[PDB]
Design a protein around this motif. Structure first.
Motif, short mmCIF file in Angstrom:
data_model
loop_
_atom_site.label_atom_id
_atom_site.label_comp_id
_atom_site.label_asym_id
_atom_site.label_seq_id
_atom_site.Cartn_x
_atom_site.Cartn_y
_atom_site.Cartn_z
N UNK A 5 39.62 56.54 32.12
CA UNK A 5 38.26 55.69 31.95
C UNK A 5 38.56 53.98 32.04
N UNK A 6 39.65 53.75 32.80
CA UNK A 6 39.92 52.25 32.88
C UNK A 6 39.19 51.61 34.05
N UNK A 7 38.76 50.26 33.90
CA UNK A 7 38.31 49.58 34.85
C UNK A 7 39.10 48.31 34.98
N UNK A 8 39.09 47.99 36.37
CA UNK A 8 39.82 46.71 36.59
C UNK A 8 39.00 46.03 37.71
N UNK A 9 39.05 44.65 37.86
CA UNK A 9 38.48 44.26 39.02
C UNK A 9 39.18 42.81 39.28
N UNK A 10 39.08 42.47 40.76
CA UNK A 10 39.94 41.51 41.08
C UNK A 10 39.27 41.27 42.58
N UNK A 11 40.10 40.14 43.04
CA UNK A 11 39.88 39.66 44.44
C UNK A 11 41.45 39.72 45.13
N UNK A 12 41.33 40.43 46.12
CA UNK A 12 42.49 40.46 47.20
C UNK A 12 42.49 39.16 48.17
N UNK A 13 43.27 38.18 48.11
CA UNK A 13 43.07 37.20 49.23
C UNK A 13 43.27 37.74 50.59
N UNK A 14 42.57 37.25 51.36
CA UNK A 14 42.38 37.73 52.72
C UNK A 14 42.33 36.41 53.79
N UNK A 15 43.48 35.99 54.22
CA UNK A 15 43.21 34.76 54.72
C UNK A 15 42.79 33.85 53.88
N UNK A 16 41.68 32.95 54.25
CA UNK A 16 41.27 32.04 53.62
C UNK A 16 40.03 32.47 52.47
#
Length: 303
Positions: A5-16
């Motif tokens: 039931x875990x949730x995690x969110x984020x951003x993967x840098x992709x170039x700029x």
């Protein structure tokens, strides 16, 4: 089960740029994680939210918004020349390496997502364990040909409205867009009114149609963008993982549209949802998640 039931969110840098992602469930203790590839191009994860259900079967489910819409970086100054299959293949490889799952992952692609997933899989990546192709074409000319066949079954004034605005190029006229929704209500999503999460995706296209307009066109069936001549049919036999093909009885991805996946992938099976069109994951959610989960338990790694 707490891990599921875990949730995690984020951003993967992709170039700029930034690739938004969401991880539901047990990424490292579970089985092979499942990456959900939304359609369009230029759609968002929102309308395929329901696949988070698979997290309750003990593997993580990864959603992400492809570059150019949703919670990822928007780039409205970029035109047809920027938005390519190779761009989204690179973004996918970037996300897989960023999450450190490129040794062991499975892909579910919905519509364009299945096209993109197939482009990824015909390269025989070693960490890929399993492929689900949901409601996808293998040849865009077949998509449009079958779309046209379905349009001939629309009410006569509706088809007349669509043709008039397509011939004139008035592809943002409300008459054209409302005529389009008659087709959508038959072959894209039969739940009326739409689930809010489906509406969230279509609202984001309306707010920034950059990618969808460049690569696809103004509507699901009027494919005039840079994908209009796309085909993977002759390369499908290179896919070397177990594949599951799903589709709806009323799907704009008609049996003829999906048939090359069934005919050409060496290790393939197929399931049909009789009360569904393009979105069995919300039109017959329980049945759709059960089939995908069972398929992944059979062919991928578990925990």
């Amino acid at each position: 089960d707490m891990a599921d039931m875990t949730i995690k969110e984020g951003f993967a840098p992709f170039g700029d740029y930034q690739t938004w992602y969401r991880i539901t469930g047990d990424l490292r203790g579970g089985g092979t994680p499942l990456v959900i590839l939304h359609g369009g191009p230029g759609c968002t994860h929102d309308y395929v939210d329901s696949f988070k259900d698979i997290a309750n079967t003990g593997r993580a489910v990864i959603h992400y918004d492809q570059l150019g819409n949703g919670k990822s970086t928007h780039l409205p100054d970029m035109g047809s020349e920027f938005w390519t299959v190779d761009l989204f293949l690179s973004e996918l490889d970037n996300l897989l390496e960023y999450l450190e799952i490129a040794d062991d992952y499975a892909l579910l692609g919905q519509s364009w997502g299945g096209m993109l997933a197939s482009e990824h899989a015909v390269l025989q990546p070693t960490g890929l364990q399993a492929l689900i192709i949901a409601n996808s074409p293998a040849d865009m000319h077949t998509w449009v040909s079958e779309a046209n066949r379905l349009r001939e079954e629309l009410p006569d004034d509706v088809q007349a409205t669509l043709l008039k605005h397509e011939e004139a190029g008035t592809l943002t006229d409300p008459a054209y867009l409302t005529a389009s929704r008659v087709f959508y209500d038959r072959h894209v999503c039969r739940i009326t009114p739409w689930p809010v999460e489906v509406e969230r995706t279509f609202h984001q296209i309306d707010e920034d149609p950059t990618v969808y307009r460049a690569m696809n066109g103004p509507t699901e069936f009027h494919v005039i963008g840079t994908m209009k001549d796309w085909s993977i049919v002759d390369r499908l036999s290179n896919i070397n993982v177990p594949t599951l093909v799903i589709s709806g009885f009323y799907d704009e991805a008609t049996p003829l549209v999906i048939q090359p996946y069934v005919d050409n992938i060496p290790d393939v099976r197929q399931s049909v949802f009789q009360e569904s069109s393009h979105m069995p994951h919300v039109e017959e959610r329980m049945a759709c998640m059960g089939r995908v989960a069972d398929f992944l338990d059979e062919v991928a790694t578990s925990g």
